[PDB]
Amino acid sequence: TCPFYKKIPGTGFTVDAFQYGVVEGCTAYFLTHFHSDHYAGLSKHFTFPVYCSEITGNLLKNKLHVQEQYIHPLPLDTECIVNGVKVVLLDANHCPGAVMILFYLPNGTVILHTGDFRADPSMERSLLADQKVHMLYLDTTYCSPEYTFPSQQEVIRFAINTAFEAVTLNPHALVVCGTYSIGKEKVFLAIADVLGSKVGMSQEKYKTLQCLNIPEINSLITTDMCSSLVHLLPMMQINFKGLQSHLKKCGGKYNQILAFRPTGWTHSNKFTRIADVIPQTKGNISIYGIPYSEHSSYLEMKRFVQWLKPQKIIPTVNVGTWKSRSTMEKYFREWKLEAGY
Ligand code: NI
């Protein structure tokens, strides 16, 4: 049945709760972002209202074929009213169209649901700053001190340098980038831009990317694989057989692949700096696994919470095991003690 941590008390609302059937008491279903663990169960036959960002609404229409009468898109950073309750959508710094949700309850309680997010000090200057938050529903994916990762900017620098050097040395090398959901677009767009190429991809993926309000996107992506020296592939194909196979399909246009798998974390981060990352290589194929995270590091998360000072924290990730839960509660307490709330 729907877990408690997907229900907003004192409203008829749920968040990211589409795989339980009709939830008893729910009048409006919010969707934070277009990732399959969160939308799971939405389809063209869904007949209740769905409240979301404009980009997420483009995706439900065009990718899931949800009928339009049921899609309720809202602007960001704007006070809106849903079934009598003031709400605000905030940029989550996750994937395109991902939002955090502010609920202002009739009784005076204020609730922030982060969805999936990568905390950043820029959030400390939105509409969050203007009033107190009583309850925080927190994206705790990496809520343990071992999880340190570099800035997104440092990771893209590494990728752009590496790609530029490989193709300048061998103009017949192809760059391949793995993907399996929206998000991490800067990886493949930043590399394409340094090489003066478009990114070539499947028709399906191309459609997806046209949903995202990306400025100048027609100048950046294509379905013609021949014209382009950065290709996007299903992540599942980012290995030596999958890449040799793809190289065979290019018909002697290329003689080397450099591939990037943008992974979340990899325990190589507990020993190795970004400058000190190395590929797995076999013959004329090299694969780099790069720690491009769209979730908070442990330190980023801690700073955000110590700044916000919520009265109660409700974890939404890693809640399935008693040892995980108990470990997160002990950190929350350390954070509160350290800061005096
Ligand atoms: Ni996500």
CA dihedral 255, 258, 261, 267 (to 10 degrees): 130
| Residue 185 backbone zone (phi > 0: left; psi -120 to 50: alpha; other: beta) | alpha
CB of 137 within 8 A of CB of 113?
A: yes
Please state, in angstroms and rounded to a whole number, the distance separating the CA atoms of residues 55 and 210: 10
Q: What is the experimental method?
A: X-ray
CB of 103 within 8 A of CB of 111?
A: yes
Distance 35 CA to ligand 1 centre (A): 5
Please state, in angstroms and rounded to a whole number, the distance separating the CA atoms of residues 170 and 298: 40
10 Å CB burial of residue 178 (0-12, 13-18, 19+) is buried
Residue 54 dihedral angles phi and psi, to the nearest 5°: -55, -45
CB of 319 within 8 A of CB of 5?
A: yes
Q: With CA atoms as reference, report the closest residue to 231 among 209, 201, 253, 260.
A: 201
Distance 141 CA to ligand 1 centre (A): 10
Distance 282 CA to ligand 1 centre (A): 32
> Which domains does the chain possess?
1-147+296-341 (3.60.15.10), 148-295 (3.40.50.12650)
Assign 79 to helix, strand or coil. Answer: coil
What was the resolution (in A) of this experimentally determined structure? 1.7
Assign 34 to helix, strand or coil. Answer: coil
Distance 229 CA to ligand 1 centre (A): 29
Distance 32 CA to ligand 1 centre (A): 9
Distance 17 CA to ligand 1 centre (A): 14
Distance 15 CA to ligand 1 centre (A): 13
> Kind of pairing, strands 13-15 and 28-30?
parallel
